[PDB]
Amino acid sequence: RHVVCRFPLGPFCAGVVGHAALPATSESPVLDAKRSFLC
Amino acid sequence: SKWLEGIRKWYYNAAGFNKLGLMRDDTIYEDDDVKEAIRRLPENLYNDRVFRIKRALDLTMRQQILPKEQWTKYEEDKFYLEPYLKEVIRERKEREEWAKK
Amino acid sequence: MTNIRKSHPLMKIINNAFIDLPAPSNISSWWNFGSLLGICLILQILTGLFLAMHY
Amino acid sequence: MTNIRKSHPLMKIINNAFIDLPAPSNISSWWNFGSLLGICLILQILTGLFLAMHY
Amino acid sequence: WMLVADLITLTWIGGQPVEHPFIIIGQLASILYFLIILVLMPITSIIENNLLKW
Amino acid sequence: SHTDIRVPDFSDYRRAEVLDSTKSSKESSDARKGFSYLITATTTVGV
Amino acid sequence: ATYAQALQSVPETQVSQLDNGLRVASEQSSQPTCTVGVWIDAGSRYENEKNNGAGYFVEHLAFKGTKNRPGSALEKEVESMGAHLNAYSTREHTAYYIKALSKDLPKAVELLADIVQNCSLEDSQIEKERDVILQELQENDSSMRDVVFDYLHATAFQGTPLAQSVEGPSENVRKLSRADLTEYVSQHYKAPRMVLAAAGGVEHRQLLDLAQKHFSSLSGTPCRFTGSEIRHRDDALPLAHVAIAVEGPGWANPDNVPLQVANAIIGHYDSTYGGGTHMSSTLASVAATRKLCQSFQTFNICYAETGLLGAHFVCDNMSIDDMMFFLQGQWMRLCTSATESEVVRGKNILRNALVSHLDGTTPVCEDIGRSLLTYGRRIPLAEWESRIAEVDASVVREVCSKYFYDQCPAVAGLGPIEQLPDYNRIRSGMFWLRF
Amino acid sequence: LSRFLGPRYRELARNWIPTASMWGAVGAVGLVWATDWRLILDWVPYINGKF
Amino acid sequence: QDLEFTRLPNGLVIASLENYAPASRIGLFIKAGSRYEDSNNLGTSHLLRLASSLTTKGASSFKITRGIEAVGGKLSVTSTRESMAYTVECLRDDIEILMEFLLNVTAAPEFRRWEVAALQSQLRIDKAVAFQNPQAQVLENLHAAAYRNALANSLYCPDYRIGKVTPDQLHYYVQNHFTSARMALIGLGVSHPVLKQVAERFLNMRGGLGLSGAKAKYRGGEIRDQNGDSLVHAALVAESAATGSAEANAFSVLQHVLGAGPHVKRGSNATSSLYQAVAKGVHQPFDVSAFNASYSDSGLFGIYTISQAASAGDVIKSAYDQVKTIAQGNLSNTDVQAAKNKLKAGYLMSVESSEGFLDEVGSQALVAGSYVQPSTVLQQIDSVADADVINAAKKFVSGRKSMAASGNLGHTPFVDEL
Ligand code: HEM
Secondary structure, three states, rough: OOOOOOOOOOOOOOOOOOOOOOOOEEOOOOOOOOOOHOO | OHHHHHHHHHHHHHHHHHHHHHOOOHHOOOOHHHHHHHHHHHHHEEEEHHHHHHHHHHHOOOOOOHHHHOOOOOOOOOEEEEEEHHHHHHHHHHHHHHOOO | OHHHHHHHHHHHHHHHHHOOOOOOOOOOOEEEEEEHHHHHHHHHHHHHHHHHHOO | OOOHHHOHHHHHHHHHHHHHOOOOOOOOOOHHHHHHHHHHHHHOOOOOHHHHHOO | HHHHHHHHHHHHHHHHHOOOOHHHHHEEEEEEEEHHHHHHHHHHHHHHHOOOOO | OOOOOOOOOOOOOOOHHHHOOOOOOOHHHHHHOHHHOOOOHHHHEEE | OHHHHHHOOOOOOEEEOOOOOEEEEEEOOOOOOOEEEEEOOOOOHHOOHHOHHHHHHHHOOOOOOOOOOOOOOOHHHHHHHOOEEEEOOOOOOOEEEEEEEEEHHHHHHHHHHHHHOOOOHHHHHHHHHHHHHHHHHHHHHOHHHHHHHHHHHHHHOOOOOOOOOOOOHHHHHOOOOOOHEEEEEHHHOHHEEEEEEEEEOOHHHHHHHHOOOOOOOOOOOOOOOOEEEEEEEEEOOOOOEEEEEOOOOOOOOOOHHHHHHHHHHHHEEEEOOOHHHHOHHHHHHHHHOOOOOOOOEEEEEEEEOOOEEEEEEEEEOHHHHHHHHHHHHHHHHHHHHHHHHHHHHHHHHHHHHHHHHHHOOOHHHHHHHHHHOOOOOOOOHHHHHHHHHHOHHHHHHHHHHHHOOOOOOOOEEEEOOOOOOHHHHHHHHHOOOOO | HHHHHHHHHHHHHHHHHHHHHHHHHHOOOOOOHHHHHOOOOOOOOOOOHHH | OOEEEEEHHHOOOOOOOEOOOOOEEEEEEEEOOOHHHHOOOHHHHHHHHOOOOOOEEEOOOOHHHHHHHHHEEEEEEEEEEEEOOOOOOOEOHHHHHHHHHHHHOOHHHHHOOHHHHHHHHHHHHHHHHHOHHHHHHHHHHHHHHEEEOOOHHHOOHHHHHHOOOHHHHHHHHHHHHOHHEEEEEEEEEEOHHHHHHHHHHHHOOOOOOOOOOOOOOOOOOOOEEEEEOOOEEEEEEEEOOOOOOOOHHHHHHHHHHHHOOOOOOOOOOOOOOHHHHHOOOOOOOOOEEEEEEOOOOEEEEEEEEEEEOOOOOHHHHHHHHHHHHOOOOOHHHHHHHHHHHHHHHHHHHHHOOOHHHHHHHHHHHHHOOOOOOOOHHHHHHHHOOOHHHHHHHHHHHHEEEEEEEOOOOOOOOOOOOO
């Protein structure tokens, strides 16, 4: 593989919804998954 | 066509907006399409148009006219607004045709 | 503080209608007649009223 | 697009006067009489006018 | 200005009685009024537009 | 703290047709709207 | 191949039933990975005020340990395989699924069985999860869309189980004991009310024999929609959330197909959409042009015998009114004057949504389980396309008139909603004098 | 007004023709009732008792 | 069937797979992004990504929007740091239509002053929406700190450049980066000859091998953001290997050894070495994973930690200590095997979806110029030895550190203190 999609978290960090135009950006694995367990 | 060119020049001289320093596109009635076209004009053209219109209004306020050699010449009159207005009207026609379907 | 002519409601209406109204600078005498009409109307009332006191 | 009621000048005035005017929720029947006065006035204008056609 | 002169003609004829020349001049004046306002003015404006290349 | 709130009991104001919570309101909607609009229509006829 | 040929070539969903009533369904697609999950027909709507948080509580401590894999061991096993274990519980369904390599199909199924049947509710684990759930509620408050939709459910289905939130009241969470959770699991986690679904590399015979191995040792109120409103006035919030709905149809009602089309005509918008003023949806175009809305979307949330059909939007303080106006106007148009071209566009949007949502083993498994729970069968995409093709402008107008025109809605507002029109004004907006 | 000479407006008309016809009947009945036409009210079975 | 991979004479790479799915998905991947911006055109890629529905030579903005929405299709632009992928997805019958629109968006853009000026504010709106979650800001600061150029550029336009991206800059960017040799046209549900024909019709005017940016120079700096948030997000990384190399596979296996993300909802992440190492001394809400960015010329590997403001230092030091212990050789073969299983499963799940498969094929075509079957990827994954993972951990521990932090800070250490 040669994509920045290394782990399910991180890539597609900030992808906005849309139709007929919906830009998205992809950074690298940035955690925050399982963070919501506790406030 | 030469007679057509002559009568067009005669009418341009008769329509006295050139006597005010104006250009043809300055006198156009500002409807929605013209308003959009003006809003699409580059800054230099918009500023030139605004100053020309203001000068014409100032001249008409005093009931005076621009000097004979300062009148806009028919052959050097530039249709600056025409392309932008054509594009705006084309876009409006496309939207209306889509609405017809 | 504020300006009464710009803040008071009736003064706001009057100022925006007849005082601070942006008006074109090149309008000729042919634009007077509108106001003239108003004057005529006012006259046609006043005079008319003083005719109704006896008619 | 817009709303004709909230955009048109006369419609703006009417909407802000009698349609979307914020009014207290607890005003009793004693606040009716105001409108009643207007009603009465209109009546006196109409009825009286028809008396002026024969008086 | 033709329309204004036509309105003046109509006023003058409305003053005048209903006799031989006044009837025909009034008919022509009314026809001209409606023709100028309805037909002649839009066509002339289109001609001017074509003369100004727009 | 949005889950501990519940709509207060409006049963003291509900029409007799919509008192039971285990019965759908789609059947009684026509009757209720018909009653209200019949009142309105009679009012309009008198006016 | 054409679109119809591609639809007809979609692999069919094979369904079998165990002797105890469990329904085992699979969709093989010849992939290295596969999703396998259990969908239980249990949720908030099957709970009363005494145990309104039982389902969410059980879901919270489903993976924390079992009678055979105490404590964290279960998790490690899943993590050892590279499998992803996930769960959720809505107002009507619960689901525990695993994404794993098809070679790991047996173990995963076994794990699921252990999660469903032999769940061990340790008291210390129960207290830990109670604290976690209380903090989760305090965090859920921050999420405005969830709050507004919970308010919509509470006001629309007041006096009925559907009004109850999935998580339940904090007092109910504190009161819930091991006995209540065990009773809830015993009553609701029963074989006839569960579906074992799988999609991907699974083979139906393998899944069926695995289910017979592990799941054999298993046990053998129409809600009333009320037109009302909940307004949580809070001027400190930056934006106002509004959710307005009307009584919708059930899962089995055919009218779900045209109604979705109708919603597809209304469409959705967000401030980050690049379509802008050129959006086909007139409401979306108006919202983009006038900056009336940060984001709005139409929804069709169906339940067993009822549903919420409407829209949700986020607006500035001074825009709510206008947005509502336009939104209602859109509905009225569909009820009175719906044209063929926009209906065709909505049908294309619905077809695209149906085909796109079913991309991936997990979405296909979720579709299989939810369809078996609700419809009792897996509706093939060919049948969906036939139902969509049956829709035209007249059908859209008739169905929208049936469900929208002159109907009492349920409204939920939250934030600076001072401009939110009064319920009488909204109700008046739900019909047209010209029509 | 070629902007409105399209298939959609033809469909739009057909959707609103029954409504416009109904409002026209309201106007017709209203005019007859308000003015007591009696050219039309003579046909009406019970109203014709008057005059 | 299988993937039909082909290289055109101009350098364009077209690949097509016919899976007979009812939906068709076509992507055009271009080697253009923030990496290929200089100090004078910062933010150009952002506006270009936001400008996928502007007027073009073939179709107008209204025509593009209405035509795409009429058939229910969707056109999206995904811009990573060193690539930009346009993609249109719709039904199998209508795909051809969208194809034209797609190649009008990229091959023949027409940036008109009024349209670009109207679009300018969308940059601010999109950046605010993206930065609603702190991870984006922390990552942008991390990439700015780690690299001196190229990869230093952020995915979003700088605030001072919001209203200053001229149409000429967009035209220059498109001309110098949207070239044939930097492009790849991948299709799912599309026949190969049709894709080749469309590529010939549109993607031939611009000669290949456009303007090439410089190699990213590692900086090893630090960027600390004081925004007063209760939770501190910290990212501490060091230069790893570039993508496509064996050491990159070693770094990915190391990331899955430490723990990339949870596999159980609300789970304790027992197999996550970093999580357990931090938990032993921290009893507050926390989260720690291994950050791994792989790029064409370089890469970053490190730890990303979300922690309490007063406990950030403890969490960061615990995670760093765990990585150091792994570097010293405290790595069991069973743990390596489990991480390899996690990596293989994650890769297969990623390529399982249509979007995932499309982006994977596009990235492979844009980086290696060829497609690699997932079997070969798995074989490469399992070829990693424990020694390789230990060496990658050593390289992280004994390498120049770059850190980006965002939160109340105060108790957050500095790069030197680590
Ligand atoms: C606030 C408004 C008005 C008030 C309070 C008012 C009051 C009165 C009163 C008390 C009378 C004596 C009637 C009687 O003794 O039989 C009267 C008579 C009359 N009013 Fe009015 N009036 C009002 C407006 C008008 C208007 C607007 C008109 C005409 C346009 C009008 C025309 C007349 C006439 C002609 C009479 C004499 C007819 C008669 O006495 O039967 N009034 N008015």
